[PDB]
Design a protein around this ligand. Structure first.
Ligand SMILES: *C(=O)CCCCCCCCCCCCCCC
Lengths: 464, 10
């Protein structure tokens, strides 16, 4: 069996709840689904619902009850959702649906998207101090999955990730950034699955690869936790011992793989960490050469930025860790994927549902050591009909890279769906995420966005 | 890119 929740986590939980229970209540974000076989019929339903919502009877009915009723309707070809906090938002929203006009809190589409979603598991550079905390405190399903990863990581590494999440005083490091994002990635995916969602395919990026292997059915939750724990601690301990001449930095710079081929001939020890976008690459190596490429970008008008690490993931530097990584991962049982995988480790190539297991000890070693072919994997997805990309992350930084690839590939209207972001209400964010998934017609039981009704007052007399 | 209060890459 597994360690329980630590007494300290409980202590921090009690105090967090104390704090939460004392903030001014913010009105919840409610999704309003409006659906029909034809778009014209959808637009008239929209207009009807709006009219009724303007009437005293409609004005007396809670947004939540309107939503629950709307959610129980039959959901057809042409869909819309209005995301609202209050009646006025709601009406303004529904008018736009009716008028075929655009709005930030509105999504409206003529029919389903024809291919399933790609779940993007990245993480690199997305951490922030409070990530996952608010959703942990407010969502029992999410909480449950966090606590399961917390239990398994306590077992693996001897500390509590949940403590970090709950404690505003702690920030994240090389090691704890990785396992905590991972917990959050696992819990988000399973929250989503709880509401009916499923990935058609996954794509990993750097530290996200362990989560993607779990959601692809490539490894058990325990074995995926091993992969992330083995690597993050080795990496943190290695990077902590680095000073002066051994230090290797990481930076994002606005050069393509092709520009980098030429540019690198001035910088013999630079390596490519992540091909992020067609025009963006994360490079790594000696500070003086990293500093030099940065200043050459600056002088050419190109963007660049350093990552906070004394160590360069995805290079030859990582060679001393591989011995121990190998040994720590003995026993992991790679399994046949239950969904498609764009493997950024394996150069962006696609592995089929039912295919051969890829997630063996050497995959983890290859992934840590070598370049991450993210953009190539994304292009491969797009070229095969995928248009929905949903990022499971505390902050949707990879999705922005995804966007650059889709556009470059000519897909100017992809479905780019974030989850959590810093400075956005986390409960709201997930409602929004599941509403988007509904609209585009991917798997998602919208009824589950509402608690089972306790009485007639939990429904609304919306027009037929 | 500014991903806004509703999950939209603006
Ligand atoms: C994707 O793997 C990287 C995400 C993790 C963020 C922190 C950066 C990792 C760099 C660690 C390398 C140091 C090891 C040095 C061994 C001698």
């Amino acid at each position: 069996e597994l360690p329980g929740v630590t007494e300290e986590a409980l202590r921090l939980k009690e105090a967090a709840l104390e704090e939460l229970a004392a903030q001014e209540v913010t009105a919840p974000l409610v999704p309003l689904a409006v659906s029909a076989f034809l778009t014209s019929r959808k637009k008239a339903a929209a207009a009807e619902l709006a009219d009724w919502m303007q009437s005293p009877e409609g004005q007396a009915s809670s947004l939540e009850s309107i939503g629950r009723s709307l959610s129980r309707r039959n959901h057809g070809r042409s869909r819309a959702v209005v995301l609202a906090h209050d009646h006025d938002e709601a009406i303004k929203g529904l008018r736009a649906v009716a008028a075929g006009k655009q709005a930030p809190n509105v999504f409206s589409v003529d029919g389903p998207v024809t291919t399933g979603p790609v779940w993007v598991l990245a993480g690199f550079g997305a951490q922030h101090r409070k990530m996952g905390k608010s959703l942990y405190l407010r969502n029992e399903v999410f909480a449950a999955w966090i606590e399961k990863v917390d239990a398994l990581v306590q077992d693996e590494l001897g500390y509590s990730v949940l403590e970090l999440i709950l404690d505003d005083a702690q920030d994240y490091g090389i090691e704890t950034t990785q396992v905590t994002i991972f917990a959050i990635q696992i819990a988000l995916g399973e929250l989503l699955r709880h509401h009916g969602a499923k990935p058609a395919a996954v794509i990993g990026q750097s530290l996200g690869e362990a989560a993607s292997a779990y959601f692809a059915g490539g490894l058990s939750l325990r074995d995926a936790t091993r992969a992330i724990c083995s690597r993050s601690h080795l990496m943190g301990e290695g990077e902590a011992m680095l000073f002066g001449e051994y230090i290797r930095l990481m930076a994002l710079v606005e050069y393509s793989a092709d520009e980098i081929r030429e540019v690198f001939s001035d910088f013999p020890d630079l390596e490519v960490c992540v091909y992020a976008a067609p025009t963006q690459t994360v490079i790594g190596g000696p500070p003086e050469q990293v500093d030099a490429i940065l200043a050459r970008a600056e002088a050419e008008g190109k963007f660049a930025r350093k990552f906070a690490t004394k160590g360069a993931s995805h290079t030859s530097q990582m060679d001393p860790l591989l011995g121990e990584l190998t040994a720590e991962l003995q026993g992991i049982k790679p399994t046949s994927p239950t969904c498609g995988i764009f493997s950024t480790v394996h150069e962006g190539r696609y592995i089929k549902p039912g295919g051969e297991p890829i997630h063996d000890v050497e995959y983890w070693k290859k992934g840590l050591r070598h370049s991450v072919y993210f953009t190539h994997g994304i292009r491969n997805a797009v070229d095969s009909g995928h248009t929905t990309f949903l990022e499971l992350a505390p902050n949707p930084v990879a999705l922005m890279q995804v966007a650059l690839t889709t556009a470059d590939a000519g897909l100017h209207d992809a479905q780019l769906i974030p989850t959590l972001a810093r400075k956005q209400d986390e409960v709201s964010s997930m409602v929004s995420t599941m509403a988007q998934l509904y609209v585009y017609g991917h798997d998602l039981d919208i009824r589950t966005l509402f608690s089972r009704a306790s009485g007639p007052q939990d429904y609304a007399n919306i027009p037929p | 890119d500014k991903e806004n209060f509703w999950g939209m890459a603006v």
